[PDB]
Design a protein around this ligand. Structure first.
Ligand code: 8N8
Lengths: 8, 269
């Protein structure tokens, strides 16, 4: 799994 | 006088620019927002139609706290420009967790406590942030102080139901996923459970809707029984089963928090 930002 | 009062520097992200106030060399951040893209509008204590973000920032600006301070703003033909106080040196909590991995519980406790105080301050000021997440938290690495940023999805706090939401879906509660309805405080507490897991495990627990509504929290890191209990309580599926802010701060895992300066000296310097 990869850690990522998430948009608003 | 806007371009005459601030020296504009490099882009920090997006459209936010580093800058310095010429009056006193205070580090600032200069945030530009296009009028055409603004969802909710409000009126200032003057009847001037401004972005809701401006309204919410003025309401929380009073005093010193763990909330980003709006120093000034300007209106332009097609945009508003927001002048924010900028900590230096700074890292946002997302990049911090990415680089450090899962945080020691002592450090997660200090951070989480400061976010709690900041969010309580917002709610005392009549403001619901609606986008609590590690991305929207800055760490002042020298002072060990956290600052909550980006009120662009916020709203005036109310006790009735919300049926709109423009924050981060993976921090949104299952009642929003299932029914497109939520109440402000219990939705905030859900996002705080997601954030605490993020801190102590090194990433958020849920990526997909089915995980969010599924009610199962698997711990991928060694996490104390007290901390696991607080997280699972914040992530109760029924909103009425979640803790109040007072119950979070009285939880056994939340006792003996470090002061901000201790936090910096032990963990950040
Ligand atoms: O980098 C960013 O996105 C932001 S937003 C407000 C401030 Br202050 C900063 Br340093």
């Amino acid at each position: 799994r990869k850690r990522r930002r998430h948009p608003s | 006088p806007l371009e005459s009062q601030y020296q504009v520097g490099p882009l920090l992200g997006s459209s936010v620019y580093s800058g310095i106030r010429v009056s006193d060399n205070l580090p600032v951040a200069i945030k530009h927002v296009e009028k055409d893209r603004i969802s909710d509008w409000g009126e200032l204590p003057n009847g001037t139609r401004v972005p809701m973000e401006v309204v919410l920032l003025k309401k929380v600006s009073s005093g010193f706290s763990g909330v980003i301070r709006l120093l000034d703003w300007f209106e332009r033909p097609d945009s508003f420009v927001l002048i924010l106080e900028r900590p230096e040196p700074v890292q946002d909590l997302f990049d911090f967790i990415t680089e450090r991995g899962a945080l020691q519980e002592e450090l997660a406790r200090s951070f989480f406590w400061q976010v709690l105080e900041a969010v309580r301050h917002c709610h005392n000021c009549g403001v619901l942030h609606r986008d609590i997440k590690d991305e929207n938290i800055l760490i002042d690495l020298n002072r060990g102080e956290l600052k909550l940023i980006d009120f662009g999805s916020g709203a005036l706090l109310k006790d009735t139901v919300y049926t709109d939401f423009d924050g981060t879906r993976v921090y949104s509660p299952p009642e929003w996923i299932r029914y497109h309805r939520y109440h402000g405080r219990s939705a905030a507490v859900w996002s705080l459970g997601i954030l605490l897991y993020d801190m102590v495990c090194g990433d958020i627990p849920f990526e997909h809707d089915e995980e969010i509504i599924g009610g199962q929290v698997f711990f991928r890191q060694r996490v104390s029984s007290e901390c696991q209990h607080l997280i699972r309580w914040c992530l109760a599926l029924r909103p009425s089963d979640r803790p109040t802010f007072e119950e979070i701060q009285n939880h056994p895992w939340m006792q003996d928090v470090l002061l901000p300066q201790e936090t910096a000296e032990i963990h950040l310097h």
